[PDB]
Enzyme design. Structure first.
Site, PDB file in Angstrom:
ATOM      1  N   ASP A  35       0.822  -1.206   0.000  1.00 53.15           N
ATOM      2  CA  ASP A  35       0.000   0.000   0.000  1.00 53.15           C
ATOM      3  C   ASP A  35       0.862   1.265   0.000  1.00 53.15           C
ATOM      4  O   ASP A  35       1.338   1.677   1.059  1.00 53.15           O
ATOM      5  CB  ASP A  35      -0.905  -0.018   1.238  1.00 53.15           C
ATOM      6  CG  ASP A  35      -1.822   1.185   1.314  1.00 53.15           C
ATOM      7  OD1 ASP A  35      -1.932   1.889   0.294  1.00 53.15           O
ATOM      8  OD2 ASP A  35      -2.444   1.400   2.389  1.00 53.15           O
ATOM      9  N   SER A 199      -0.596  15.545 -12.129  1.00 53.10           N
ATOM     10  CA  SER A 199      -0.857  15.198 -13.510  1.00 53.10           C
ATOM     11  C   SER A 199      -1.088  16.462 -14.336  1.00 53.10           C
ATOM     12  O   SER A 199      -1.622  17.447 -13.849  1.00 53.10           O
ATOM     13  CB  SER A 199      -2.061  14.262 -13.581  1.00 53.10           C
ATOM     14  OG  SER A 199      -2.458  14.001 -14.912  1.00 53.10           O
TER      15      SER A 199
END
Length: 330
Positions: A35, A199
């Site tokens: 994770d 992004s």
């Protein structure tokens, strides 16, 4: 040193991925959920409340000659999906794919929430975010990666998650045969303890690319792709009959649909998520309403590039002095 381990979807939907991990001496092998959005290595154990164990493999520290109680240490974690666990702490030897760390904090669960109990395939979590998020008190502990880092050939790990198929986590090296083209690297902020990056935009299907900054986290422990409501609405508007359902808890779509791809930007590069990766199947057995793999982050407070996005790429988690993230197509 290096390590290399195969990671395997837990079910036919790729709801999560499990990777075998050796703990203790002699080895006890547990299947952990790696994770990159948290920083605790915790396991089902011989100390876990019996009624809360249902099919998981447990770690028994009393059977490990290298286990030592970390005196006074406790831990307690709550995840973004509402699940939780807590307990005490041992140090022990932990190996992943041939890479060994001695003195790793292994957090032994005394209590786990129902969603953990109900998932027989996940024996615990191995956190790979920054150690500043580790919950051990009163002395915060380091992640497996942080402990291994100085010994690694290169201070990196890579995630290569499969679509409906096994993939690989590598530690300490970049497998140049595992991706196509070049890896594009992008800046990381560690201010919130995550692999947080920005992004450069998105496209839906064959549509034009929208240049827009989207801050979010690379999180292997989250199943879906969670993005701003504007972006998510633009995606689902291209699927006839798709709608946001408050009763179901997100966007659903007719199972008869063919889903468009979704592209996200990494600098000047582009990662394409095929439409099929965005299908999470019937909302309930036999239903013709299917659950979408792109959902709104509104009210999470952060955008999450979870498995839906990451499995479309070869992803480098670069833990150099100034961390960065790399993405390549594959």
């Amino acid at each position: 040193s290096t390590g290399s381990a195969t990671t395997t979807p837990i079910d036919s939907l790729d709801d999560a991925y499990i990777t075998p991990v050796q703990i203790g001496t002699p080895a006890q092998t547990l299947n952990l959920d790696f994770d990159t959005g948290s920083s605790d290595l915790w396991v089902f154990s011989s100390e876990t409340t019996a009624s809360e164990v249902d099919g998981q493999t447990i770690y028994t520290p009393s059977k490990s000659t290298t286990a030592k109680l970390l005196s006074g240490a406790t831990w307690s974690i709550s995840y973004g999906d509402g699940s939780s666990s807590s307990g005490d702490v041992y140090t022990d030897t932990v190996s992943v794919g041939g890479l060994t760390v001695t003195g790793q904090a292994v957090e032994s669960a005394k209590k786990v929430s129902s969603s953990f109990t109900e998932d027989s395939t996940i024996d615990g979590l191995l956190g790979l975010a920054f150690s500043t998020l580790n919950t051990v008190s009163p002395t915060q502990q380091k992640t497996f990666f942080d402990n291994a880092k100085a010994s690694l050939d290169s201070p990196v790990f890579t995630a290569d998650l499969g679509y409906h198929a096994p993939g690989t986590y590598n530690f300490g090296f970049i497998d140049t045969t595992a991706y196509t083209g070049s890896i594009t690297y992008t800046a990381v902020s560690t201010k919130q303890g995550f692999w947080e990056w920005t992004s450069t935009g998105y496209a839906v299907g064959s549509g034009t690319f929208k240049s827009t900054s989207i801050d979010g986290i690379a999180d292997t422990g989250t199943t879906l792709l969670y993005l701003p409501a504007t972006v998510v609405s633009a995606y689902w508007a291209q699927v006839s009959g798709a709608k946001s359902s408050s009763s179901v808890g997100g966007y659903v779509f007719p199972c008869s649909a063919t889903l468009p791809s979704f592209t996200f930007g990494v600098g000047s590069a582009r990662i394409v998520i095929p439409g099929d990766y965005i299908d999470f199947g019937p909302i309930s057995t036999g239903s013709s309403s299917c659950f979408g793999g792109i959902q709104s982050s509104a009210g999470i407070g952060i955008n999450i590039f979870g498995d839906v996005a990451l499995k479309a790429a070869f992803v480098v988690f670069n833990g150099a002095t100034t961390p960065t993230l790399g993405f390549a197509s594959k």
